[model samples]
Target: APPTLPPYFMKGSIIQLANGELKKVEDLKTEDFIQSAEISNDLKIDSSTVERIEDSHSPGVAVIQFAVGEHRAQVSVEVLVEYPFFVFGQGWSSCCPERTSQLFDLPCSKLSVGDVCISLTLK
Candidate 1:
């Protein structure tokens, strides 16, 4: 059976992007460029094009998945949503750890894995 999402996730979790700077996932378009280590070292060459976006439907969280190049990652911003969460593709791996941890004031211990779903909250 599928896992039952928590009541807290009834509203769903929000998604965002680090395109040049932090941006709402919805604000990003299909052609937008997103920085990712899976691309390159140069910020310009190391960027990936936003191909598609979708919801995982977990619970109070709005789990979002973004397809960039041949790689993809799931992250949340806020919503009023699912699982199999994965970490950023290299670029975000270095920055998101700190940014997300601070965003939710989470301990480093909780973010050791790529499961962003377990680390997000509406509050």
Candidate 2:
């Protein structure tokens, strides 16, 4: 049988592996590994990895470019950040760049010009 993690650990809590893989606590097992990483309130992170537990269904909101298979869409960044793990319960439509601009609910017209891109996915 697999051993269980501590009680305080939550599903969305991030875990830094020995190999530097940042994974959610829900994906971790006792057979995996860890170090003496601590937790705190806002601005608690100052390392190569940062982990936060999702305590509510409503997560922080921001603009994000989301992907489904090879199709990509510009959606709320909060959606991807909060719902890191998603299950296809029903069919959905493909969102292109133009439609993405409209869905952003903000002025995305100038977004393509001199836009700074940041990589959020861990490699």
Please give each candidate's TM-score.
Answer: 0.19, 0.20
Per-residue lDDT of candidate 1, residues 13-121 (tens digit): 2343334443433232223333332133343322232222333354434323333334554233433121222233322221233433344332122212222221222
Off by over 4 Å in 1: 1-45, 60-123
State, as a TM-score between 0 and 1, how close model 1 is to the true structure. 0.19
Worst ten in a row by lDDT for model 2: 43-52
**Residue 75 lDDT, candidate 2, scale 0-100:** 32
**What's each prediction's clash count?**
19, 1
- Among these predictions, the greatest TM-score belongs to 2
Query: lDDT tens digits, residues 1-123, model 2?
Result: 224333233334466655566776545432233221122122111111112222234434333333323233333343322222211221111112234323332111212211222222322
**What is the C-alpha local distance difference test score of candidate 2?**
0.30
